[PDB]
Amino acid sequence: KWYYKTITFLPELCNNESLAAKCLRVLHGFNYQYETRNIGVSFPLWCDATVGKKISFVSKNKIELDLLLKQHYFVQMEQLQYFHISNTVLVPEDCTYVSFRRCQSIDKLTAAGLARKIRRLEKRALSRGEQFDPSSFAQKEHTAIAHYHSLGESSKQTNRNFRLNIRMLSEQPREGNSIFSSYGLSNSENSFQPVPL
Amino acid sequence: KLPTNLAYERSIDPSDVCFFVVWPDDRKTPLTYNSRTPHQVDFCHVPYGASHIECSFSVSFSSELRQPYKCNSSKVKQTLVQLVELYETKIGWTELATRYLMNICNGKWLWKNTRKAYCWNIVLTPWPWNGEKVGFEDIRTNYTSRQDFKNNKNWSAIVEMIKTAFSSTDGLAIFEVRATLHLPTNAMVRPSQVFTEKSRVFQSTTIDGERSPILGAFKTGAAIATIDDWYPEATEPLRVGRFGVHREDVTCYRHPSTGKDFFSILQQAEHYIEVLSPAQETINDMHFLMANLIKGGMFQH
RNA sequence: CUGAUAACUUCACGGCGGGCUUGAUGUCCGCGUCUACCUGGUGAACUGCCGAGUAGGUAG
């Protein structure tokens, strides 16, 4: 009894990161005007290398998904036909079943991010005693990172080119009765909520 | 001409470079990097809390340009022996020795690690030597032209002892070189890269047990040899090769259609004995001829 | 429009006995491979917060 809004990502010369973010940035302007928690992630054509075309939009209250769909982006990208509206159909209750969660561990692995980390560990140990050195803090030689399909995003308030990191987990048939958040999640403070794709 | 077997041996001997991280407590550790994964990508940075970064190599100025290594013919023997022996008198080793030394002095061998730096200082250690360590302090704001070097207390002796190292048979001159780079916090360091015939795999070595990058020994031999601006309408100094090859753009100057490559000047060796027995271009191409015999190479067809 | 026209070769079967390739053997002396080599990440994935934490989490 969920819905789905299958999009079509056609014109054969297009980025997969900049358009999956801008169709999510127009979702990011949402939930700051009509503050809901109910719209998911659901990539149908996720693959390993060079993620494909389709994205979807899944909810149980299932009438904000058309309210989200008419928010000065499809009413602004209509004639030069980049995308088109789906048929607003009930999700059949037997399908494939994945989960989308922000990992956020990868963001604190880069060399600037580890210097961002050990700067914070410098000051919050203000309860004295030892006089520690920053010499015994290192990443060693070896971090094996396969694939995570990062999505870049500019900050709302200031000028920061931050980035997201979400991968695939497909099990656990019962968590999360539509308890999503601003970006759509399965990690923070609520559950590890799966997605019916 | 060019009788099928001729070869010289090089006359400048640089070594690898080593990167050490000095702490505020006067402790030095090797600079170690990180690897991320066939497809493998490397990442190197200054560790947080460090004062600056040190570098040390060594170079030698020997005399293997007086006679060839194999010669095959006693008409190209006494001709090329006489050219290097007449260039010693009429021209002198001054214009070459000053150009090789400044690329050692002004940190040219630090390729792209000087961009975004506050201050760097370079200390020589010559041999044989009676005296003091030679210094070049805050090079960006104190030493920028041929004349700032000539105001130094110790420039008359280090332009010397290379001039003797080319003039006297079985000569020698050895320089130890040390540099300190004051780079900002969490600054990126750029070493050499392994070839890997088809990314960014570092050339490493083992210093005190842990791995560390080198920035190459053929890489730092290219930086000292960039003294070539006698190709016609020259705007930028190039590395000394036979056909004046530029690397960034994939063109080359000095092409044999121009008549200014090495093999069309080496054949003209008997022509230049007459004038040296003239300051317009007969000088400005022997600086290219002498810088090829200092380079080395097989000269044969 | 053929040295033309037509055309059933068949039934049965025990190769067997015996057997010493041997004796002997010194592959040695001499030897220079070498000279010369750029792989090219501009700025780029930035700054917090909880937790004792090189574990873990969490923000725009």
Side-chain angles (χ1 to χ4, degrees):
Chain A
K1 59 181 179 291
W2 303 92
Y3 283 177
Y4 63 94
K5 273 76 180 173
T6 299
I7 210 70
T8 299
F9 183 65
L10 54 93
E12 189 67 27
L13 66 161
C14 53
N15 194 1
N16 294 318
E17 181 175 1
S18 233
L19 272 299
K22 187 63 182 174
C23 190
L24 196 146
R25 183 173 173 84
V26 299
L27 192 149
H28 185 72
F30 187 73
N31 294 325
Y32 290 153
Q33 294 180 358
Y34 295 100
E35 288 81 3
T36 65
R37 294 294 180 183
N38 293 316
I39 298 96
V41 184
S42 64
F43 293 101
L45 290 181
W46 189 278
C47 62
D48 195 0
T50 311
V51 66
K53 294 166 69 176
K54 270 70 178 175
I55 79 169
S56 176
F57 296 100
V58 179
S59 295
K60 279 191 182 295
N61 288 322
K62 77 185 176 66
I63 48 94
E64 68 273 16
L65 292 174
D66 291 333
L67 188 146
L68 193 150
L69 191 60
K70 282 79 176 175
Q71 285 180 356
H72 195 76
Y73 64 97
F74 190 78
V75 192
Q76 290 297 111
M77 277 83 81
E78 67 279 19
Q79 295 296 321
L80 60 163
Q81 190 73 41
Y82 291 163
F83 307 106
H84 70 278
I85 295 172
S86 179
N87 296 113
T88 310
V89 177
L90 281 77
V91 170
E93 291 84 5
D94 292 330
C95 181
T96 188
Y97 193 73
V98 298
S99 177
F100 290 98
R101 55 182 292 170
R102 181 181 178 179
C103 295
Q104 197 180 4
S105 178
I106 295 167
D107 199 3
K108 294 179 74 69
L109 294 178
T110 311
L114 194 144
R116 190 184 301 118
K117 180 176 71 176
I118 63 173
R119 175 61 178 85
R120 185 177 180 271
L121 276 74
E122 179 69 31
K123 186 56 69 179
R124 61 93 44 80
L126 195 63
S127 296
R128 289 294 95 201
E130 71 272 16
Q131 291 177 335
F132 63 97
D133 292 333
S135 297
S136 66
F137 292 100
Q139 53 187 359
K140 306 286 103 177
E141 287 181 356
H142 289 164
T143 54
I145 303 167
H147 65 280
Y148 55 96
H149 281 172
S150 68
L151 292 174
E153 180 68 27
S154 176
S155 177
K156 296 294 295 296
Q157 188 267 328
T158 179
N159 289 317
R160 304 296 179 87
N161 296 109
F162 72 98
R163 193 175 294 273
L164 281 302
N165 43 3
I166 296 95
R167 205 181 294 116
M168 302 293 284
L169 279 81
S170 65
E171 202 64 28
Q172 204 271 326
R174 185 178 177 179
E175 274 177 353
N177 207 168
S178 177
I179 54 174
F180 286 137
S181 179
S182 176
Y183 293 99
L185 87 173
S186 295
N187 57 357
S188 174
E189 293 292 327
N190 52 6
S191 174
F192 289 171
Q193 176 177 3
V195 173
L197 189 140
Chain B
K1 299 297 288 182
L2 276 303
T4 205
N5 198 0
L6 180 60
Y8 277 81
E9 188 177 358
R10 80 180 81 176
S11 297
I12 290 169
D13 284 312
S15 66
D16 281 327
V17 188
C18 296
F19 296 100
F20 288 96
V21 176
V22 56
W23 295 103
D25 293 330
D26 197 73
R27 295 177 64 248
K28 296 192 286 186
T29 63
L31 176 60
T32 180
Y33 64 92
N34 297 114
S35 180
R36 182 178 176 179
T37 300
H39 189 194
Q40 182 181 3
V41 172
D42 287 328
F43 292 94
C44 183
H45 286 88
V46 177
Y48 177 73
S51 179
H52 57 277
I53 302 300
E54 289 185 354
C55 299
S56 66
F57 71 104
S58 64
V59 71
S60 296
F61 291 94
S62 177
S63 173
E64 289 91 5
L65 76 156
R66 303 296 297 273
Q67 291 191 0
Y69 183 77
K70 296 185 289 292
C71 189
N72 204 174
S73 178
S74 182
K75 62 182 72 66
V76 299
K77 183 69 179 296
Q78 67 270 15
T79 301
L80 292 175
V81 166
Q82 189 173 359
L83 278 170
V84 183
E85 192 174 2
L86 286 175
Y87 185 81
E88 177 176 352
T89 299
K90 181 67 72 176
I91 303 303
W93 297 107
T94 300
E95 184 63 30
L96 288 173
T98 307
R99 291 182 188 269
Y100 286 112
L101 184 61
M102 288 175 68
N103 288 321
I104 301 171
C105 290
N106 65 7
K108 179 69 178 295
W109 53 272
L110 296 169
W111 286 93
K112 289 183 180 180
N113 294 319
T114 62
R115 296 177 69 245
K116 302 295 186 291
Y118 292 163
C119 177
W120 65 88
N121 303 321
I122 288 173
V123 175
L124 297 176
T125 310
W127 183 81
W129 185 252
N130 296 114
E132 187 65 28
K133 305 291 288 295
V134 184
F136 297 98
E137 66 277 12
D138 200 2
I139 300 170
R140 177 181 290 178
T141 61
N142 287 319
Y143 292 100
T144 59
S145 357
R146 292 171 64 96
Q147 189 60 42
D148 282 332
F149 292 110
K150 198 175 264 77
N151 294 120
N152 214 169
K153 183 177 86 273
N154 288 317
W155 188 259
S156 300
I158 289 95
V159 169
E160 198 67 31
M161 91 186 286
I162 298 172
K163 188 182 293 296
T164 65
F166 289 167
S167 295
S168 298
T169 180
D170 197 77
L172 189 66
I174 295 168
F175 291 99
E176 299 289 327
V177 177
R178 188 174 299 277
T180 60
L181 285 168
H182 294 283
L183 290 172
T185 179
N186 205 170
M188 58 186 287
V189 182
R190 294 176 184 267
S192 289
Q193 296 179 359
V194 182
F195 187 75
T196 68
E197 172 66 29
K198 66 184 181 294
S199 297
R200 194 176 75 201
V201 177
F202 287 159
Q203 293 179 358
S204 64
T205 194
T206 301
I207 300 165
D208 292 332
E210 58 179 356
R211 67 176 184 175
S212 297
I214 56 169
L215 191 66
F218 296 101
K219 180 72 176 175
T220 181
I224 296 169
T226 58
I227 61 169
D228 192 6
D229 58 351
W230 298 282
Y231 63 100
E233 293 177 350
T235 185
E236 199 271 326
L238 268 70
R239 192 259 188 274
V240 177
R242 276 81 190 174
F243 303 111
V245 173
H246 196 278
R247 177 172 175 264
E248 297 294 327
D249 51 350
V250 293
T251 186
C252 66
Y253 303 100
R254 289 281 188 184
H255 192 76
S257 66
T258 312
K260 301 298 287 185
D261 58 349
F262 178 69
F263 296 105
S264 296
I265 301 169
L266 183 67
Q267 290 175 354
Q268 294 299 110
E270 199 273 331
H271 177 79
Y272 291 106
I273 302 296
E274 298 172 352
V275 294
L276 291 176
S277 296
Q280 62 282 19
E281 291 297 326
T282 63
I283 290 179
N284 291 114
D285 56 355
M286 296 191 292
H287 292 283
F288 181 75
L289 197 149
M290 288 294 108
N292 279 310
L293 301 182
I294 298 172
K295 184 186 183 296
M298 283 87 85
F299 297 156
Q300 48 87 29
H301 194 193

